[PDB]
Structure 1
């Protein structure tokens, strides 16, 4: 009901790896090795030259499933970033990437984006000291995001954290791995992040 169903499957449809899986989306299982076709009876069948519509729909779906939120919440986003002063594409990206759940992932307190959401929504995180259990929450920059201490020694936490001892973090972010604090310093520009998405095709999808 949000997405919540098979996934290394829509890795497949969207036609490239997304890492909604974390560990093992880096396996030689991501099912993207073993299976670069789409789901269905027809996955192994020969391509059809897609529709201008098709392509744009697809790009949108991709961006969506990466960030892993509802159409509604996503569109309300785009519309929001559309309205704001600045370049509608990169702002979409700024805003999306400014979601608490996704900050958690990007700070590596969770392995996958969906884990990071459950992490939040179960109370494990705090933004500047008050536990904040909505995943939509907007991280403004200058905000510090920690595992709050009650959870600080629980299993999965120490797992990730003590496994991320040594890693670099995204350059709009900082990490004190001991304290499991992190700061969201600044906003990402397009290639501040990675993404396998021509954002401009999404802008176009909505201009329909």
Structure 2
């Protein structure tokens, strides 16, 4: 199941922008609640939980399968933090969101659930696809005729496509080439506290 309640509540309580263009946040950064002014006592667990929640709702990932993320990252021989960030950025949802074919990660998930795309010529209608390397992601004719996808493809003029990701032309073919690196990704927050909380 996904989140059906308000989405701006998340940013308001979290104290940082999630989508990026929040007028309501900039109008009132204080987290909701009749006591959004009470001073918050320092707590290492508190901050670890804060970081965990922010990352989880930022990526739309469910709690259990993101624990699965963390354990899988431990399993891989590389460093746990960058392994986790790699495996969570590999999400087809994040791929479409950051390739300019989805305005928001939630909309990418909605479209994938609708099943309007072809991956390597095989129909797929699952959000959490594992986008390997060298792969190719397509979009099919009914998706093309769909209006909002057209708008997104002409609106992909935001923060430019990251290094390993790129779009080749009007058909919007997305292909990944090399290994994303933490420094170039510059995904926000620090994996230190996430790994600490899950190693608790």
TM over 0.5: yes
| Structure 1 gap segments, 5+ residues each | 20-24
Q: Name the CA shift for 1:76/1:162 in 2 (closer, same or farther; >3 Å).
A: same
Q: Is the contact between residue 165 and residue 177 of structure 1 (CA under 8 Å) also seen in structure 2?
A: no
Higher helix share: 2
1:120·1:135 contact (CA, 8 Å) conserved in 2? Answer: yes
User: Unaligned stretches of 5+ in structure 2?
Assistant: none
Among 21, 33, 39, which residue is 2:26 paired with?
Answer: 33
Shift of 1:46: 3.1
Q: Could you tell me which residue of structure 2 aligns to residue 178 of structure 1?
A: 170
- CA distance in structure 1 between the aligned counterparts of 2:29 and 2:156, rounded to whole angstroms: 30
- 1:176 aligned counterpart, secondary structure: coil
In the alignment, which residue of structure 2 is the partner of 1:131? 123
Distance 2:10 2:185 in 1: 21
What is the alpha-carbon distance in structure 2 between the residues aligned to residue 78 and residue 4 of structure 1?
A: 25
Instruction: Give me the TM-score of the superposition, normalised by structure 2.
Output: 0.93
Poorly superposed stretches of 4+, deviation over 3 Å: none
| Number of equivalent positions | 200
* Counterpart position of 2:6: 6
Whole-angstrom CA distance in 2 between matches of 1:40 and 1:164: 36
Do the aligned residues in 2 keep the contact of 1:3 with 1:70 (CA within 8 Å)? no
Does residue 1:207 correspond to 2:186, yes or no? no
Partner of 1:22: none
